[PDB]
Amino acid sequence: ATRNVLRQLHELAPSIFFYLVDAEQGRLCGYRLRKDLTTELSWELTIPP
Amino acid sequence: GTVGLLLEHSFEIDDSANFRKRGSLLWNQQDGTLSLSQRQLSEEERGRLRDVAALNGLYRVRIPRRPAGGYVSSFVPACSLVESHLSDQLTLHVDVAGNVVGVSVVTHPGGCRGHEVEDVDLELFNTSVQLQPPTTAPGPETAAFIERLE
Amino acid sequence: DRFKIEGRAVVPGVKPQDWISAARVLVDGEEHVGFLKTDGSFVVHDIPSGSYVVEVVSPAYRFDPVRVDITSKGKMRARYVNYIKTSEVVRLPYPLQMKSSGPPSYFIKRESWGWT
Amino acid sequence: HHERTFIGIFLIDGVTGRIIHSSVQKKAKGPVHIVHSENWVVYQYWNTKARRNEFTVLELYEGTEQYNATAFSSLDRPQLPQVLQQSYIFPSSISAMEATITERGITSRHLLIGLPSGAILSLPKALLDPRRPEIPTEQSREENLIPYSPDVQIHAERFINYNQTVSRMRGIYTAPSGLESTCLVVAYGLDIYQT
Amino acid sequence: AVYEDQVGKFDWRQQYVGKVKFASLEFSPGSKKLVVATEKNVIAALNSRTGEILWRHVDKGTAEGAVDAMLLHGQDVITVSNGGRIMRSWETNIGGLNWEITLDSGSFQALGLVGLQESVRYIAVLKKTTLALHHLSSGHLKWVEH
Ligand SMILES: *[C@@H]1O[C@H](CO)[C@@H](O[C@@H]2O[C@H](CO)[C@@H](O)[C@H](O)[C@H]2NC(C)=O)[C@H](O)[C@H]1NC(C)=O
Numbered sequence: 001a002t003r004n005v006l007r008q009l010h011e012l013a014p015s016i017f018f019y020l021v022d023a024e025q026g027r028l029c030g031y032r033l034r035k036d037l038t039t040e041l042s043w044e045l046t047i048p049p
Numbered sequence: 050g051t052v053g054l055l056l057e058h059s060f061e062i063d064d065s066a067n068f069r070k071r072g073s074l075l076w077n078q079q080d081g082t083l084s085l086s087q088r089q090l091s092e093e094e095r096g097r098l099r100d101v102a103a104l105n106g107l108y109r110v111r112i113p114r115r116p117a118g119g120y121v122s123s124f125v126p127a128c129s130l131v132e133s134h135l136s137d138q139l140t141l142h143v144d145v146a147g148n149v150v151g152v153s154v155v156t157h158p159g160g161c162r163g164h165e166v167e168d169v170d171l172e173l174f175n176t177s178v179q180l181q182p183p184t185t186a187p188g189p190e191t192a193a194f195i196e197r198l199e
Numbered sequence: 200d201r202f203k204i205e206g207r208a209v210v211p212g213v214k215p216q217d218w219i220s221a222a223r224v225l226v227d228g229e230e231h232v233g234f235l236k237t238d239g240s241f242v243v244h245d246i247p248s249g250s251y252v253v254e255v256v257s258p259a260y261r262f263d264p265v266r267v268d269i270t271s272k273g274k275m276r277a278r279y280v281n282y283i284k285t286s287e288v289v290r291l292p293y294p295l296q297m298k299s300s301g302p303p304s305y306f307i308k309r310e311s312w313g314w315t
Numbered sequence: 316h317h318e319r320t321f322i323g324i325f326l327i328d329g330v331t332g333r334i335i336h337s338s339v340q341k342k343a344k345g346p347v348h349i350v351h352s353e354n355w356v357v358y359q360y361w362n363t364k365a366r367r368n369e370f371t372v373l374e375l376y377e378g379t380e381q382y383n384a385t386a387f388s389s390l391d392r393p394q395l396p397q398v399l400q401q402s403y404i405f406p407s408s409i410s411a412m413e414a415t416i417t418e419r420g421i422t423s424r425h426l427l428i429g430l431p432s433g434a435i436l437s438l439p440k441a442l443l444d445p446r447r448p449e450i451p452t453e454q455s456r457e458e459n460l461i462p463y464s465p466d467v468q469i470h471a472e473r474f475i476n477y478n479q480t481v482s483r484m485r486g487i488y489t490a491p492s493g494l495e496s497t498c499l500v501v502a503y504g505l506d507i508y509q510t
Numbered sequence: 511a512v513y514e515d516q517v518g519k520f521d522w523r524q525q526y527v528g529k530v531k532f533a534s535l536e537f538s539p540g541s542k543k544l545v546v547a548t549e550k551n552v553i554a555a556l557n558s559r560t561g562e563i564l565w566r567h568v569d570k571g572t573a574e575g576a577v578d579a580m581l582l583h584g585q586d587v588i589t590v591s592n593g594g595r596i597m598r599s600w601e602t603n604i605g606g607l608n609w610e611i612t613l614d615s616g617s618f619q620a621l622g623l624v625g626l627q628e629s630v631r632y633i634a635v636l637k638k639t640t641l642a643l644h645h646l647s648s649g650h651l652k653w654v655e656h
């Protein structure tokens with residue numbers, strides 16, 4: 001978490017996405033990174049277990 | 050029998066979640082048909098949409114799962130929708146048993162060339178709606194091989 | 200409703216004590232595992248009714264797999280293995296008489312002198 | 316139950332969430348071994364109606380003109396690809412599966428398969444091609460494509476380990492090794508093997 | 511490999527056994543052996559001079575191959591496994607197998623060795639309900655009591 005890395009992430013935030021899979025509930029989620037290293041929900045899918 | 054599903058759309062300046070009712074989907078399982086009933090945009094809605102498209106915002110669509118039991122949602126660039134004269138396509142992916150799995154939204158054509166669109170081109174929803182069940186994978190054909198081997 | 204599979208394994212020209220220490224018998228591809236006795240015979244236990252493929256694995260000799268069909272009552276039959284045209288039936292003796300065919304070939308040969 | 320079991324395959328986009336492909340294979344049971352590489356997916360399963368192990372290969376193609384040859388943005392792809400599928404019969408079980416890698420991807424691609432007996436098999440990828448025709452034609456000849464055959468055979472000459480068998484295999488790892496013709500393979504189970 | 515000439519020039523293999531659970535070292539001891547059983551459901555015989563492997567047997571990896579009890583007698587090993595279901599008599603000298611039998615249902619509690627008139631000839635098996643005595647030479651059941 002250096003200053004240069006923090007600046008680069010502040011510049012490049014809206015181009016990085018996370019996707020998570022929960023097998024117990026069969027739920028897939030996808031978030032997008034924000035400027036201040038926070039995340040917001042973008043997409044969601046469900047498969048009935 | 051026919052069922053009804055709510056369909057909400059959201060767009061904001063700061064890219065938050067402010068979903069509100071947009072339309073209703075009528076789904077008939079017997080013949081497997083899907084139809085949409087919606088309303089046209091208001092004035093301040095058009096202004097806010099133009100601002101969102103200017104600020105490279107997003108346009109989110111959400112439908113529930115049970116015709117507060119859950120939601121399925123997706124998003125598309127707003128500028129790619131404004132420049133397309135509100136011509137878009139929605140696909141509803143369903144399970145094998147008949148459970149709603151997902152919703153997808155696309156526009157034709159894609160991309161953002163930075164054109165200029167006036168207010169008179171934002172009055173109608175050229176929207177297509179499609180349903181999608183899973184296909185069936187093929188198997189290893191052998192009878193033709195056996196008979197040709199003879 | 201649990202049954203067993205019995206058989207014997209013989210390698211021609213070699214007495215059994217030289218190779219049984221590094222061999223197994225597999226039923227339905229590691230679903231059931233058995234080991235060879237001193238003289239070569241083997242028995243696998245707790246096999247439910249159905250159809251299975253029995254083979255003998257050893258890193259120095261070859262053995263052909265055999266299909267075994269076991270009914271609900273317990274009467275069992277043995278036949279060849281074929282994945283195309285599965286309905287074909289060719290009888291094989293039971294209890295299993297699995298005889299080796301020779302060491303496997305892991306390598307590729309070359310060419311000798313041409314003209315005398 | 317042996318008549319109401321199935322395996323579902325989903326090809327999805329990680330950014331937006333579009334389900335690019337949905338498929339279901341009936342009369343099938345696990346475990347499932349899958350390899351997903353540059354353009355294709357190959358997965359194996361067990362078929363109960365015939366009681367045999369089967370391979371399935373899916374391959375994706377675009378049209379005849381590039382939509383965009385300068386970049387690839389997942390927010391600007393409104394056209395679904397074309398999917399070609401095929402299946403084959405494999406006369407054994409599988410303990411592991413992996414694909415070879417190289418520096419530039421110039422050499423041919425092979426699948427390393429770890430059998431329960433202990434040996435490791437090298438299967439060419441060109442054998443598993445969905446474009447192989449059932450009825451040979453002149454175009455097939457000019458493309459130099461082998462006619463379809465439903466069975467793949469196992470030969471002892473194709474093993475990469477002569478008799479250094481690996482028992483209870485669990486993983487196969489491949490490395491480029493700074494050369495366009497050699498790949499380093501490490502198979503780890505109860506034993507450890509390197510070649 | 512290929513050509514039968516590059517054998518051992520590029521490849522190498524290392525063999526292993528799991529964490530030890532039971533062991534037995536008393537022997538002739540003219541023969542140098544060390545019979546061991548691990549938690550990976552594998553039973554092996556290691557050389558004592560160097561530590562190599564003379565023979566090894568690998569069972570199922572799931573819980574249906576766990577070894578419950580192990581005993582040694584002369585040149586033979588007696589093993590009870592599969593949740594008190596399978597009993598085996600391993601011949602240590604050759605690495606083969608003398609006999610293998612299946613016990614009745616129940617839960618294994620303890621394994622013992624009994625004899626008469628300065629000669630051991632029977633094996634005693636205890637399960638939460640019953641007690642059984644079997645022959646040692648052939649494994650045939652002698653009797654069972656409740
Ligand atoms: C309304 O939406 C459609 C949805 O794609 C737009 O696309 C046309 O769709 C029709 C129906 O298949 C095709 O025949 C046309 O070729 C499509 N247009 C183009 C440019 O490819 C359509 O353009 C939109 N506007 C209308 C119909 O006025």
Ligand SMILES: *[C@@H]1O[C@H](CO)[C@@H](O[C@@H]2O[C@H](CO)[C@@H](O)[C@H](O)[C@H]2NC(C)=O)[C@H](O)[C@H]1NC(C)=O
Nearest residue numbers: 159160161162163382383384385386387388391
């Ligand atoms: C192919 O995609 C690239 C990436 O989006 C496009 O390049 C961008 O084009 C827009 C306007 O078309 C410009 O505002 C951007 O500055 C461009 N970015 C880069 C990195 O080049 C390109 O135009 C697309 N090509 C076609 C034929 O549509």
Ligand SMILES: *[C@@H]1O[C@H](CO)[C@@H](O[C@@H]2O[C@H](CO)[C@@H](O)[C@H](O)[C@H]2NC(C)=O)[C@H](O)[C@H]1NC(C)=O
Nearest residue numbers: 221258259305306477478479514515516517518
């Ligand atoms: C695996 O195969 C190799 C084949 O080379 C065996 O090595 C040969 O063993 C014989 C018997 O001792 C020797 O006469 C040869 O000289 C060996 N070949 C070489 C190149 O050294 C090897 O023994 C086999 N593995 C086992 C466990 O037997």
